[PDB]
Enzyme design. Structure first.
Site, short mmCIF file in Angstrom:
data_model
loop_
_atom_site.label_atom_id
_atom_site.label_comp_id
_atom_site.label_asym_id
_atom_site.label_seq_id
_atom_site.Cartn_x
_atom_site.Cartn_y
_atom_site.Cartn_z
CD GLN B 76 -10.82 1.31 2.94
OE1 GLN B 76 -10.92 2.77 2.88
NE2 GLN B 76 -11.04 0.52 3.39
CE1 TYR B 143 -11.00 -1.77 9.95
CE2 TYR B 143 -9.42 -1.09 8.20
CZ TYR B 143 -9.86 -1.08 9.43
OH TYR B 143 -9.26 -0.39 10.29
N1 LIG Z 1 -8.23 5.45 14.03
C1 LIG Z 1 -9.03 4.54 13.98
O1 LIG Z 1 -10.20 4.67 14.37
C2 LIG Z 1 -8.45 3.03 13.66
C3 LIG Z 1 -8.80 1.96 14.30
C4 LIG Z 1 -8.33 0.90 14.40
C5 LIG Z 1 -7.43 0.53 13.28
N2 LIG Z 1 -7.24 1.69 12.42
C6 LIG Z 1 -6.21 1.36 11.30
O2 LIG Z 1 -4.89 2.07 11.71
C7 LIG Z 1 -4.21 2.62 10.50
C8 LIG Z 1 -3.67 4.01 10.74
O3 LIG Z 1 -4.77 5.22 10.16
P1 LIG Z 1 -5.12 6.68 10.54
O4 LIG Z 1 -5.99 6.80 11.82
O5 LIG Z 1 -3.96 7.35 10.67
O6 LIG Z 1 -5.97 6.98 9.42
P2 LIG Z 1 -6.10 7.93 7.98
O7 LIG Z 1 -7.02 7.32 6.82
O8 LIG Z 1 -5.92 9.47 8.12
O9 LIG Z 1 -4.39 7.58 7.49
C9 LIG Z 1 -3.89 6.56 6.53
C10 LIG Z 1 -2.58 7.02 5.72
O10 LIG Z 1 -2.08 5.94 4.70
C11 LIG Z 1 -2.05 6.27 3.65
N3 LIG Z 1 -2.33 5.28 2.49
C12 LIG Z 1 -3.25 4.65 2.22
N4 LIG Z 1 -3.04 3.66 1.21
C13 LIG Z 1 -1.74 3.79 0.97
C14 LIG Z 1 -1.02 2.99 -0.10
N5 LIG Z 1 -1.63 2.28 -0.73
N6 LIG Z 1 0.15 3.08 0.10
C15 LIG Z 1 0.98 3.84 0.93
N7 LIG Z 1 -0.02 4.51 1.91
C16 LIG Z 1 -1.08 4.72 2.03
C17 LIG Z 1 -2.80 7.30 3.28
O11 LIG Z 1 -2.46 8.37 2.58
C18 LIG Z 1 -2.80 8.09 4.80
O12 LIG Z 1 -1.65 9.08 5.15
C19 LIG Z 1 -4.95 2.21 9.38
O13 LIG Z 1 -4.12 0.97 8.90
C20 LIG Z 1 -6.25 1.87 9.84
O14 LIG Z 1 -6.76 0.75 9.08
C21 LIG Z 1 -7.82 2.96 12.41
#
Ligand SMILES: NC(=O)c1ccc[n+]([C@@H]2O[C@H](COP(=O)([O-])OP(=O)(O)OC[C@H]3O[C@@H](n4cnc5c(N)ncnc54)[C@H](O)[C@@H]3O)[C@@H](O)[C@H]2O)c1
Ligand SMILES: NC(=O)c1ccc[n+]([C@@H]2O[C@H](COP(=O)([O-])OP(=O)(O)OC[C@H]3O[C@@H](n4cnc5c(N)ncnc54)[C@H](O)[C@@H]3O)[C@@H](O)[C@H]2O)c1
Lengths: 311, 311
Positions: B76, B143
């Site tokens: 999430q 988070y």
């Molecule tokens: N991009 C940023 O700014 C940022 C920075 C630091 C950390 N993060 C973290 O890094 C990761 C990657 O994110 P992203 O940028 O691709 O974002 P995003 O929200 O576009 O993608 C997340 C993906 O994981 C899936 N998902 C969610 N819950 C799930 C579940 N219960 N089971 C299986 N799949 C599930 C979603 O369908 C999606 O495809 C995340 O874990 C996030 O917490 C994001």
């Protein structure tokens, strides 16, 4: 003031309840009796037999008692069990813990006093040193991870929702009424068995046959005192220990002395999840007037006396 | 080597999948499509439409693909959402993560690469400083608490069960295919709105009308590179950022320049739960030769171009 004590039917919890009762406060107990006993909860005290993992049960308890303060002592209290069954430790300490938190913000609880583990959350404590609250959490076992994780949640619950909290990082708590089934419950296991001429197992810190691990032993009476202090005026993280370490062999010899019987020892290799050495600095809490009014030798004598007459 | 990448249908996950594929690796994706898209996964890549919260489901995916390595990007990803729905954040990131770890243990996975968050675990980063991996976690939201907690589990699973792990603390990741919800969602929001000629909401840092909050923006292409480096030769905690901060105002100005249009600005006072400044130290990863190959201005242009074609 209405204090709901989770795990109040347990070792430490029962001492907290009696302490609170002696201060004339209104108290309630929430416990699923997984390891605690109903006998531990005095007659004049409402008892909610519910599991923290049961959301509906926790909500009904809060609705009927409407607590202003929550003392959270319920948990899977065993390093060994957490290593053998990480999912079970997670479910009760985290999942069950989250249910409790959600119920707190929902019912506007003022403060939550948590039972954390000062003995395992800091990781190995080097020779000649004592762990301070400013030290970062470096858990080794899933049990220590669930406790460190819960501390993080109450920290964000304080910042995000205004929930007041305190995390009491207990050292190895011992004393009357504890059960002979725990990593720190070594004092109970030793006292009960040695008095009955039963062979005891001494787990090594490194090699089967050595002196064993070192821990900071705190009398449960002093822990209950720290808890009352925290409930009324503290916020934040506080170690609850003595500041002196003892090897497992020293514990056995002290118990043997009080029991008046020679011990029968069976050496065993170190068990998974255990840290070799843990000693805590009690300075931050002592600044608030708290102090362990019961020393180690005296504490063991009081515990052995309990088991000598315990039926 | 068989690599399973959870969250592989999302923003960062899809770029990771392409990168691993370009290196001739056998890759599989596990995603529940909560916020991901089926089209992000290229033909030929086994896709497991499973929710991490479903033990039976994850169990099945592991049985069929039998991964040797796992990249855990599912989660999430919204800080704001976790604040309004902590339980949801907990279930997916911790309960879901735990199920994954158990699967790794049961099927003997070699290493797990985790997507952690630099921007939210360290907390407020003082002026002129850059957060180092040795700084302690100081989460502010559920988070961030979720991410910090999972890091503890990775460390204990490493010490207790021999699972090798790497925790990548990403800065604000931006680039094509991103949505407007992640930590660097502001880039997708500005890109989409500036192109459409819609007013842009610019939240103040401290005082209304200021430059806005500071974050360490890293192009997704560069995080994909770091991920491959870590998966193959790193263990422990590594920050993945540029080590340079940018205010929200310059992000908007960079988007405006790339879009070639004067944006309509809708000022707004600083919102709570928002960190004023975050900048990561990239020294530890840089010591292994890694370096961003895409500068901010160039990265924003590539992102705006992606949104131009987004019908
Ligand atoms: N991009 C940023 O700014 C940022 C920075 C630091 C950390 N993060 C973290 O890094 C990761 C990657 O994110 P992203 O940028 O691709 O974002 P995003 O929200 O576009 O993608 C997340 C993906 O994981 C899936 N998902 C969610 N819950 C799930 C579940 N219960 N089971 C299986 N799949 C599930 C979603 O369908 C999606 O495809 C995340 O874990 C996030 O917490 C994001
Ligand atoms: N005793 C020590 O030396 C020590 C030291 C540091 C921390 N701890 C921690 O402090 C607490 C334990 O106190 P204790 O020494 O009395 O131990 P204990 O194991 O004797 O008692 C635990 C009590 O909580 C209950 N419980 C467990 N799971 C429950 C659940 N799902 N829902 C409701 N109730 C449940 C048990 O029935 C029992 O009454 C735990 O939070 C433990 O992790 C123990």
């Amino acid at each position: 003031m209405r204090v709901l004590v989770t795990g109040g039917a347990g070792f430490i919890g029962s001492h907290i309840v009696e302490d609170l009762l002696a201060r004339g406060l209104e108290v309630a107990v929430l416990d699923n009796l997984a390891t605690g006993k109903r006998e531990n909860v005095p007659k004049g005290v409402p008892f909610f037999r519910v599991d923290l993992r049961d959301k509906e049960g926790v909500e009904r308890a809060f609705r009927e008692f409407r607590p202003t303060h929550v003392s959270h002592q319920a948990a899977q209290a065993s390093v060994k069990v957490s290593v053998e069954d990480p999912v079970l430790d997670f479910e009760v300490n985290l999942l069950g813990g989250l249910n409790l938190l959600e119920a707190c913000r929902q019912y506007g609880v003022e403060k939550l006093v948590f039972a954390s583990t000062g003995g395992a959350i800091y990781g190995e404590v080097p020779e000649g040193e004592r762990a301070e609250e400013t030290w970062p959490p470096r858990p080794k076992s899933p049990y220590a991870a669930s406790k460190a994780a819960f501390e993080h949640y109450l920290s964000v619950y304080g910042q995000s929702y205004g929930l007041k909290w305190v995390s009491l990082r207990y050292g190895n708590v011992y004393g009357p009424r504890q059960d002979p089934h725990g990593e720190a419950g070594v004092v109970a296991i030793f006292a009960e068995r040695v008095l009955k001429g039963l062979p005891v197992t001494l787990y090594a810190r490194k090699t089967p046959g050595d002196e064993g691990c070192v821990r900071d032993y705190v009398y449960v009476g002093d822990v209950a005192e720290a808890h009352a202090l925290a409930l009324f005026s503290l916020e934040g993280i506080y170690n609850v220990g003595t500041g002196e370490g003892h090897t497992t062999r020293e514990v056995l010899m002290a118990v043997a002395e009080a029991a008046g019987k020679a011990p029968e020892v069976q050496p065993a290799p170190p068990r998974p999840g255990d840290l070799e050495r843990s000693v805590l600095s009690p300075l931050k809490l002592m600044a608030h007037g708290w102090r362990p009014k019961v020393g180690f030798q005296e504490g063991i004598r009081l515990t052995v006396d309990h088991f000598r007459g315990a039926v």
